[PDB]
Coordinates of C-alpha atoms in Angstrom, one line a residue:
Chain A
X1 CA 118.8 38.3 21.6
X2 CA 116.0 38.2 18.9
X3 CA 113.3 38.9 21.0
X4 CA 115.3 41.2 23.2
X5 CA 116.0 43.2 20.2
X6 CA 112.6 43.7 18.6
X7 CA 111.1 46.8 19.6
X8 CA 111.9 50.5 19.4
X9 CA 115.2 52.1 20.4
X10 CA 116.2 55.7 20.8
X11 CA 119.5 57.5 20.4
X12 CA 121.2 60.3 22.2
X13 CA 120.1 62.4 19.4
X14 CA 116.2 61.8 19.3
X15 CA 116.4 59.3 16.7
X16 CA 114.1 56.5 16.8
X17 CA 114.1 52.6 15.1
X18 CA 111.5 50.0 15.4
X19 CA 112.9 46.8 14.4
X20 CA 111.9 43.0 14.3
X21 CA 114.6 40.4 14.6
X22 CA 113.5 37.5 12.7
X23 CA 114.0 33.8 14.0
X24 CA 117.2 33.5 11.2
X25 CA 118.9 36.7 11.7
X26 CA 117.0 39.3 9.8
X27 CA 116.6 42.5 10.9
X28 CA 113.5 44.4 9.4
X29 CA 112.0 47.9 10.7
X30 CA 112.1 51.7 10.2
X31 CA 114.2 54.6 11.4
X32 CA 112.7 57.8 12.3
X33 CA 114.5 61.3 12.2
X34 CA 113.9 63.8 14.8
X35 CA 110.8 65.9 15.1
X36 CA 109.1 62.4 14.4
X37 CA 106.8 63.8 11.7
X38 CA 105.8 61.1 8.8
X39 CA 108.4 62.2 6.3
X40 CA 110.8 61.4 8.7
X41 CA 110.7 57.6 8.4
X42 CA 113.0 55.3 6.3
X43 CA 113.4 51.7 5.7
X44 CA 116.0 49.9 7.6
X45 CA 117.3 46.2 6.7
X46 CA 120.0 44.2 8.5
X47 CA 121.2 40.7 10.0
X48 CA 122.1 39.8 13.3
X49 CA 123.7 36.5 15.0
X50 CA 120.5 34.4 15.9
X51 CA 122.8 32.1 18.1
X52 CA 125.1 34.1 20.0
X53 CA 126.7 32.6 24.9
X54 CA 127.9 31.3 28.2
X55 CA 130.1 34.2 28.9
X56 CA 127.7 37.0 28.8
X57 CA 129.0 38.4 25.4
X58 CA 126.8 40.7 23.3
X59 CA 124.9 39.9 20.0
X60 CA 126.6 41.2 16.9
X61 CA 124.3 42.8 14.3
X62 CA 124.3 45.5 11.8
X63 CA 121.7 47.3 9.3
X64 CA 121.5 49.8 6.7
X65 CA 119.4 53.1 5.9
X66 CA 119.4 54.5 2.4
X67 CA 118.4 58.0 2.8
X68 CA 115.6 58.2 0.4
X69 CA 111.8 58.1 1.0
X70 CA 108.9 60.0 -0.7
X71 CA 109.8 63.4 0.8
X72 CA 113.8 63.3 0.7
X73 CA 116.5 61.9 -1.4
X74 CA 119.9 62.8 0.6
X75 CA 121.8 60.5 -1.8
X76 CA 123.5 58.6 1.0
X77 CA 123.4 55.6 3.2
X78 CA 124.4 54.6 6.6
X79 CA 125.5 51.3 7.9
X80 CA 125.6 51.0 11.9
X81 CA 127.9 47.8 13.1
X82 CA 127.8 46.8 16.5
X83 CA 126.4 44.5 19.7
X84 CA 123.1 44.2 21.8
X85 CA 123.7 43.7 25.4
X86 CA 120.3 42.7 27.1
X87 CA 119.5 42.8 30.5
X88 CA 117.7 45.6 33.0
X89 CA 119.4 48.2 30.9
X90 CA 119.7 46.9 27.4
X91 CA 121.5 48.6 24.7
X92 CA 122.9 48.5 21.1
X93 CA 126.4 50.2 21.2
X94 CA 127.3 50.8 17.7
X95 CA 129.8 52.7 15.4
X96 CA 128.6 53.6 11.9
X97 CA 129.3 55.1 8.4
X98 CA 127.7 57.3 6.4
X99 CA 128.6 57.5 2.7
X100 CA 127.2 60.1 0.4
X101 CA 127.6 59.5 -3.8
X102 CA 130.1 61.8 -4.7
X103 CA 131.8 62.7 -8.1
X104 CA 135.5 61.0 -8.1
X105 CA 137.1 64.1 -7.3
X106 CA 135.7 63.9 -4.0
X107 CA 135.4 60.2 -3.7
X108 CA 138.1 60.8 -1.1
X109 CA 135.6 62.7 1.5
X110 CA 132.7 60.6 1.1
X111 CA 132.4 58.9 4.3
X112 CA 131.8 60.0 7.7
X113 CA 132.5 57.8 11.1
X114 CA 130.6 58.3 14.1
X115 CA 129.2 55.9 17.0
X116 CA 125.7 55.8 18.6
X117 CA 124.2 53.8 21.6
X118 CA 120.4 53.1 21.3
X119 CA 118.5 52.3 24.7
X120 CA 114.6 51.2 25.1
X121 CA 114.0 54.3 27.1
Chain B
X1 CA 120.5 65.4 6.6
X2 CA 118.1 63.2 8.3
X3 CA 120.4 61.0 10.4
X4 CA 121.3 64.1 12.5
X5 CA 119.9 65.6 15.5
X6 CA 117.1 68.1 15.7
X7 CA 118.0 71.2 14.1
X8 CA 116.3 73.5 16.5
Chain C
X1 CA 122.6 51.7 -10.6
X2 CA 120.1 48.7 -10.1
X3 CA 120.6 47.0 -13.1
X4 CA 124.5 48.0 -13.2
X5 CA 124.5 46.8 -9.4
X6 CA 122.9 43.2 -9.8
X7 CA 125.3 40.6 -10.6
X8 CA 128.4 39.2 -9.1
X9 CA 131.1 41.0 -7.7
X10 CA 134.8 40.3 -6.8
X11 CA 137.2 41.9 -4.3
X12 CA 140.8 42.0 -3.8
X13 CA 140.7 39.0 -1.2
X14 CA 139.1 36.5 -3.3
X15 CA 135.5 37.0 -1.7
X16 CA 132.4 36.6 -4.2
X17 CA 129.1 38.5 -3.5
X18 CA 126.2 38.1 -5.7
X19 CA 123.2 40.5 -5.4
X20 CA 119.9 41.7 -6.9
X21 CA 119.1 45.5 -6.5
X22 CA 115.2 45.7 -6.1
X23 CA 113.6 48.6 -7.9
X24 CA 112.7 50.2 -4.4
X25 CA 116.3 50.4 -2.8
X26 CA 116.4 46.6 -1.7
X27 CA 119.8 44.6 -1.8
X28 CA 119.7 40.8 -1.5
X29 CA 122.3 38.2 -2.1
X30 CA 124.8 36.1 -0.2
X31 CA 128.5 36.5 0.3
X32 CA 130.9 33.9 -0.2
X33 CA 134.4 33.5 1.4
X34 CA 137.4 32.4 -0.6
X35 CA 137.9 28.7 -1.4
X36 CA 134.5 29.1 -3.0
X37 CA 133.0 25.8 -1.3
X38 CA 129.1 25.6 -0.3
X39 CA 129.6 26.2 3.5
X40 CA 131.1 29.7 2.6
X41 CA 128.2 31.5 1.8
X42 CA 126.4 33.8 4.1
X43 CA 123.4 36.0 3.5
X44 CA 123.4 39.9 2.9
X45 CA 120.6 42.2 2.7
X46 CA 121.1 46.1 2.5
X47 CA 119.6 49.3 0.7
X48 CA 121.0 51.5 -1.8
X49 CA 119.7 54.7 -3.3
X50 CA 117.5 53.9 -6.4
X51 CA 117.2 57.5 -7.5
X52 CA 120.9 59.0 -7.5
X53 CA 122.4 62.2 -10.9
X54 CA 123.4 64.7 -13.7
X55 CA 126.8 65.0 -12.4
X56 CA 128.2 61.9 -12.5
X57 CA 128.0 60.8 -8.9
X58 CA 128.1 57.3 -7.3
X59 CA 125.3 55.3 -5.8
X60 CA 125.2 55.2 -2.1
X61 CA 124.6 51.9 -0.8
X62 CA 125.6 49.6 2.1
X63 CA 124.9 45.6 3.1
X64 CA 125.4 43.6 6.1
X65 CA 126.4 40.1 6.4
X66 CA 126.0 38.2 10.0
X67 CA 128.5 35.4 10.0
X68 CA 126.5 32.5 10.9
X69 CA 125.2 29.9 8.5
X70 CA 124.9 25.9 9.0
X71 CA 128.6 25.2 8.9
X72 CA 130.0 28.2 10.9
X73 CA 129.2 30.8 13.3
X74 CA 131.9 33.4 13.8
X75 CA 129.7 35.5 16.3
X76 CA 130.3 38.8 14.1
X77 CA 128.8 40.9 11.8
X78 CA 130.2 43.0 8.8
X79 CA 128.4 46.1 7.3
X80 CA 130.2 47.8 4.3
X81 CA 129.2 51.2 3.4
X82 CA 130.3 52.7 -0.3
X83 CA 129.1 54.1 -3.5
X84 CA 128.7 51.9 -7.1
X85 CA 130.2 53.9 -10.0
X86 CA 129.3 52.3 -13.0
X87 CA 130.5 52.4 -16.7
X88 CA 133.4 50.3 -18.5
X89 CA 135.0 49.6 -15.1
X90 CA 132.5 49.7 -12.5
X91 CA 133.3 49.2 -8.9
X92 CA 132.0 49.6 -5.8
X93 CA 134.2 51.4 -3.4
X94 CA 133.6 50.5 0.5
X95 CA 135.1 51.0 3.8
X96 CA 133.6 48.4 6.4
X97 CA 133.0 47.8 10.2
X98 CA 133.1 44.2 11.6
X99 CA 132.0 43.8 15.1
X100 CA 132.4 40.7 17.1
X101 CA 130.0 40.0 20.3
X102 CA 132.1 40.5 23.3
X103 CA 132.0 40.8 27.0
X104 CA 131.8 44.2 28.5
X105 CA 135.6 44.2 29.6
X106 CA 136.5 43.7 25.6
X107 CA 133.9 45.9 24.2
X108 CA 136.6 48.5 23.5
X109 CA 138.3 46.1 21.4
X110 CA 135.1 44.7 19.4
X111 CA 135.3 46.7 15.8
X112 CA 137.7 46.2 13.1
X113 CA 137.9 48.8 10.4
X114 CA 138.9 48.2 6.4
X115 CA 138.0 48.9 2.9
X116 CA 137.2 46.8 -0.2
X117 CA 137.0 47.7 -3.8
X118 CA 134.6 45.3 -5.7
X119 CA 134.9 45.0 -9.6
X120 CA 133.1 42.8 -11.7
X121 CA 135.9 40.9 -13.2
Chain D
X1 CA 162.1 50.1 9.9
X2 CA 163.4 53.4 11.1
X3 CA 166.0 53.8 8.2
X4 CA 163.6 52.3 6.0
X5 CA 160.7 54.7 7.0
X6 CA 162.9 57.8 6.7
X7 CA 162.6 59.4 3.4
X8 CA 159.9 60.5 0.8
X9 CA 156.4 58.8 0.6
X10 CA 154.0 59.4 -2.1
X11 CA 150.3 58.5 -1.9
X12 CA 147.6 57.9 -4.8
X13 CA 146.4 61.5 -4.7
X14 CA 149.5 63.2 -5.5
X15 CA 150.6 64.2 -1.8
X16 CA 154.1 63.9 -0.7
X17 CA 155.3 63.5 3.1
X18 CA 159.1 63.6 4.0
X19 CA 159.8 62.1 7.5
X20 CA 162.8 61.3 9.8
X21 CA 162.3 58.4 12.1
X22 CA 164.2 58.8 15.2
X23 CA 166.0 56.1 17.2
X24 CA 163.4 55.9 19.8
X25 CA 160.2 56.3 18.0
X26 CA 159.8 59.7 16.9
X27 CA 158.4 60.7 13.5
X28 CA 159.0 64.3 12.1
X29 CA 158.6 65.7 8.9
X30 CA 156.3 67.9 6.7
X31 CA 153.2 67.1 4.3
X32 CA 152.9 68.8 1.4
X33 CA 149.3 69.0 -0.6
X34 CA 149.1 68.5 -4.3
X35 CA 150.4 71.2 -6.7
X36 CA 153.7 71.3 -4.7
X37 CA 153.9 74.7 -4.0
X38 CA 155.7 75.9 -0.6
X39 CA 152.3 77.0 1.0
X40 CA 151.1 73.5 0.7
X41 CA 153.5 72.6 3.6
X42 CA 152.4 71.3 7.0
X43 CA 154.1 69.9 10.0
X44 CA 153.7 66.3 11.1
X45 CA 154.7 64.7 14.2
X46 CA 153.8 60.9 15.1
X47 CA 155.5 57.8 16.5
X48 CA 156.3 54.2 15.5
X49 CA 157.4 50.9 17.0
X50 CA 161.2 51.1 17.1
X51 CA 161.3 47.5 18.1
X52 CA 158.9 45.6 15.7
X53 CA 160.1 41.0 14.1
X54 CA 161.0 37.4 13.4
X55 CA 157.7 36.6 11.3
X56 CA 157.8 39.3 8.8
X57 CA 155.1 41.8 10.5
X58 CA 155.1 45.3 9.5
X59 CA 155.9 48.0 11.8
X60 CA 152.9 50.2 13.4
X61 CA 153.2 53.8 13.4
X62 CA 150.6 57.0 13.2
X63 CA 151.0 60.6 12.7
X64 CA 149.2 63.7 13.0
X65 CA 149.0 66.8 10.6
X66 CA 146.7 70.1 11.8
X67 CA 146.0 71.9 8.7
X68 CA 147.0 75.2 9.7
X69 CA 150.6 77.0 8.3
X70 CA 151.1 80.6 7.5
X71 CA 148.9 80.6 4.2
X72 CA 146.1 78.3 5.2
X73 CA 144.0 77.5 8.2
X74 CA 141.4 74.8 7.2
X75 CA 140.6 74.2 11.2
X76 CA 141.0 70.4 11.0
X77 CA 143.6 67.9 11.7
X78 CA 143.8 64.3 10.2
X79 CA 145.7 61.4 12.1
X80 CA 146.8 58.3 10.1
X81 CA 147.4 55.0 11.6
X82 CA 149.0 51.8 9.7
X83 CA 152.0 50.0 9.2
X84 CA 155.2 50.1 7.5
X85 CA 156.4 46.9 5.3
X86 CA 160.0 47.1 3.9
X87 CA 161.3 45.5 1.0
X88 CA 161.8 45.8 -2.9
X89 CA 158.7 47.4 -2.8
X90 CA 158.1 49.0 0.6
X91 CA 154.6 50.9 1.5
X92 CA 152.8 52.2 4.8
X93 CA 149.5 51.2 4.4
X94 CA 146.9 53.3 6.4
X95 CA 143.5 54.5 7.5
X96 CA 143.0 57.9 8.4
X97 CA 140.4 60.1 10.6
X98 CA 140.0 63.7 9.6
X99 CA 138.4 65.8 12.1
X100 CA 137.0 69.3 11.9
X101 CA 136.2 71.8 14.5
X102 CA 132.5 72.1 14.4
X103 CA 130.0 73.8 16.9
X104 CA 128.1 70.8 19.3
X105 CA 125.2 70.5 16.7
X106 CA 127.1 69.5 14.0
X107 CA 129.7 67.5 16.0
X108 CA 127.9 64.3 14.9
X109 CA 129.4 64.9 11.3
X110 CA 132.8 66.0 12.2
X111 CA 135.0 63.2 11.2
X112 CA 135.7 61.6 8.0
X113 CA 137.3 58.3 7.5
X114 CA 139.5 56.9 4.5
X115 CA 142.7 55.1 3.7
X116 CA 146.1 56.0 1.9
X117 CA 148.7 53.5 0.7
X118 CA 152.2 55.5 0.4
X119 CA 154.9 54.1 -1.7
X120 CA 158.6 55.8 -2.2
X121 CA 157.9 55.7 -5.9
Chain E
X1 CA 142.2 76.2 23.2
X2 CA 146.3 75.5 24.1
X3 CA 146.2 77.0 27.7
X4 CA 142.5 75.2 28.0
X5 CA 144.1 71.9 26.3
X6 CA 147.3 71.8 28.5
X7 CA 146.8 69.5 31.6
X8 CA 145.6 66.0 32.6
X9 CA 142.6 64.6 30.9
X10 CA 140.9 61.4 31.9
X11 CA 138.7 59.1 29.8
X12 CA 135.8 56.5 30.6
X13 CA 138.5 53.7 30.9
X14 CA 140.4 54.8 33.6
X15 CA 143.3 56.1 31.4
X16 CA 145.3 59.3 32.0
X17 CA 146.9 61.5 29.5
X18 CA 149.2 64.8 30.3
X19 CA 149.7 67.0 27.9
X20 CA 151.2 70.7 26.9
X21 CA 149.7 72.5 23.9
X22 CA 152.8 74.7 22.5
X23 CA 152.2 78.0 21.2
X24 CA 152.6 76.9 17.5
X25 CA 150.3 73.7 17.6
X26 CA 152.7 71.1 19.4
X27 CA 151.0 68.3 21.4
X28 CA 153.3 66.7 23.8
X29 CA 153.0 64.7 27.0
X30 CA 152.4 61.0 27.9
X31 CA 149.8 58.4 28.3
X32 CA 149.3 56.3 31.5
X33 CA 147.5 53.0 31.2
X34 CA 145.0 52.1 34.1
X35 CA 146.4 50.8 37.4
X36 CA 148.4 54.0 37.0
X37 CA 151.9 52.3 37.9
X38 CA 155.1 53.9 36.4
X39 CA 155.5 51.3 33.8
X40 CA 152.0 51.9 32.3
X41 CA 153.6 55.3 30.7
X42 CA 154.0 56.0 27.1
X43 CA 155.2 59.0 25.1
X44 CA 152.4 61.2 22.7
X45 CA 152.9 63.5 20.2
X46 CA 150.5 65.5 18.3
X47 CA 149.0 68.8 16.8
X48 CA 146.4 70.7 17.4
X49 CA 144.8 74.3 15.4
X50 CA 146.5 77.1 17.3
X51 CA 144.2 79.4 15.5
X52 CA 140.4 78.1 15.7
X53 CA 136.5 81.0 16.3
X54 CA 133.4 83.5 16.3
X55 CA 131.0 80.7 16.3
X56 CA 131.6 78.4 19.2
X57 CA 133.5 75.7 17.5
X58 CA 135.6 73.1 19.1
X59 CA 139.6 73.1 18.2
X60 CA 140.7 69.9 15.9
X61 CA 143.5 67.9 17.4
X62 CA 145.2 64.5 16.9
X63 CA 148.0 62.6 18.7
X64 CA 149.6 59.1 18.3
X65 CA 151.0 56.9 21.2
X66 CA 153.2 54.0 19.9
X67 CA 152.8 51.4 22.6
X68 CA 156.5 50.6 23.2
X69 CA 158.2 52.0 26.3
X70 CA 160.8 50.0 28.7
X71 CA 158.7 47.6 30.2
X72 CA 156.1 46.6 27.2
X73 CA 156.3 46.3 23.5
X74 CA 152.4 45.9 22.3
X75 CA 153.7 46.4 18.8
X76 CA 151.0 48.7 18.1
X77 CA 150.2 52.5 17.6
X78 CA 147.0 54.2 18.2
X79 CA 146.3 57.9 16.9
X80 CA 143.1 59.9 18.4
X81 CA 141.5 62.5 15.9
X82 CA 138.7 64.9 17.5
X83 CA 138.1 68.5 18.9
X84 CA 138.5 70.0 22.3
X85 CA 135.6 72.2 23.4
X86 CA 136.0 74.3 26.2
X87 CA 134.1 75.7 29.1
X88 CA 132.6 74.8 32.5
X89 CA 132.5 71.2 31.5
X90 CA 135.6 71.0 28.9
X91 CA 136.3 67.7 27.0
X92 CA 137.8 66.3 24.0
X93 CA 135.5 64.1 22.0
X94 CA 137.8 61.7 19.6
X95 CA 137.5 58.3 17.6
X96 CA 140.6 56.3 17.3
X97 CA 142.5 53.9 15.1
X98 CA 145.1 50.9 16.7
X99 CA 146.8 49.5 14.2
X100 CA 149.0 46.3 15.1
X101 CA 152.1 45.2 12.7
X102 CA 151.0 41.9 11.3
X103 CA 152.0 39.7 8.5
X104 CA 150.5 40.2 5.1
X105 CA 147.8 37.6 5.5
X106 CA 146.6 39.1 8.7
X107 CA 146.8 43.0 7.3
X108 CA 143.0 43.1 6.6
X109 CA 142.2 42.5 10.4
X110 CA 144.8 45.0 11.9
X111 CA 143.0 48.1 12.8
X112 CA 140.3 48.6 15.3
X113 CA 138.2 51.7 15.6
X114 CA 136.7 53.3 18.8
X115 CA 135.9 56.5 20.5
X116 CA 136.9 58.2 23.9
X117 CA 135.6 61.5 25.4
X118 CA 138.3 62.8 27.9
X119 CA 137.4 65.3 30.8
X120 CA 139.4 67.3 33.3
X121 CA 137.7 65.4 36.2
Chain F
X1 CA 141.0 71.1 1.7
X2 CA 144.8 70.7 1.5
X3 CA 144.5 66.8 2.3
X4 CA 142.8 66.6 -1.4
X5 CA 143.8 65.5 -4.7
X6 CA 144.8 68.4 -7.1
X7 CA 141.5 69.9 -7.8
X8 CA 142.5 70.4 -11.7
Chain G
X1 CA 137.3 34.3 10.2
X2 CA 135.0 34.0 7.0
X3 CA 135.6 37.5 5.8
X4 CA 139.5 37.0 5.1
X5 CA 141.5 35.9 2.3
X6 CA 142.1 32.4 1.6
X7 CA 144.3 31.0 4.6
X8 CA 146.6 29.0 2.0
Chain H
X1 CA 146.8 45.8 25.6
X2 CA 147.9 48.8 27.6
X3 CA 145.1 51.1 26.0
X4 CA 142.4 49.0 27.5
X5 CA 140.3 49.4 30.7
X6 CA 141.9 47.8 34.1
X7 CA 141.7 44.0 33.6
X8 CA 140.6 43.6 37.3

């Protein structure tokens, strides 16, 4: 984990996320939306289990991205919860929740759910 | 939305 | 938001979370499990929409807690995605994902889903 | 369960659902959207654990509603997964998934997640 | 849809589900757990949008399985919410919720969330 | 959407 | 689990 | 659980 987590990860939609896993569980980095142009970067912050494992389990982690930067404000935030599996073909398998700020009448429809698999390739 | 695929 | 978010929040299970919302979207604080004894504190980090709103919408936010500190290592992490509604009775309504690190055979059952409503009282 | 489940249930949004729990696990009934006018009814079908319990556990159940009838076609379906707790104040606590049919480019945003608590009052 | 849905579907875990999509939205069939031995079959019931589409959208559907039959009673139920995409390589992409009946103290951890992709091959 | 609260 | 209610 | 993969 940690050293294995630090780096660039790509998902099946063309998004790129670059993160540094700190010694004590911190996750810091940026998320880049497709196209890959400057203004597609958002800050991400999260945490991971720095002491995961005699039975080959994955490392639990999660991070959040608020979709606001100096070019866009999508008035929403997404959190990814999942685990890191290292090895020849390491991957981070996640499920995410994307919540948009709504008025109280639309609160019932404010959150979408999905899943993403990130690889180093 | 910035979390989506390319729109292309 | 921001000033309205900073403070102590309590949920319907007896958990307490204290956070500081930074000027540029950062969320930093600690989560305390019930009982309220020292060793029940974990670090939390997240992000929120610092520029939410002419139609009374809530402020989207999310945060993560890895369940490891110097007394416990539950080999899991939880992410909360939701929105902050301020006013007389402010609240943060969330849905969460709790993922435990598992072997690949148990990966299909690694994530639980729930919801929490936090109030200042 | 079964006899305790059969009846009318109401949720915090003003929706009404009337169901019959069959001896062998079947759940059949109709869901009515707010207002309560004729054209607000949709068919629901589901299943429940007909043999739940020496430790006061709830009864797991789930049902589906496709949002199409002879007045409306919202091109979506919702499934509710939860458990029935009987007694003085019986309730069905659920989490739901609402998926809309989308083109492949919007598939990532096709499902919303929420929770509902139904009571007999 | 309907004719395209009727048949046998397999997921990435080795489970098989056989369903009949009725003219008016009904979904009826059986779910078989891996191994493929008799006692691995459970009844499934659901609904789908019988009138989905001039823009190639998928067909929304959902179904429920209560994990009880004459050999096993896992005191739980799962609901799958998703959409059917037909064509050369048809598939049903879903997200599911699995709820177990718990005592009230464990209700917060009663539901797991996952996703499944079913193909005809 | 029919699953929502009254719109009122 | 630390995210739960009191166990009491 | 019956919804899982083979246990094998």
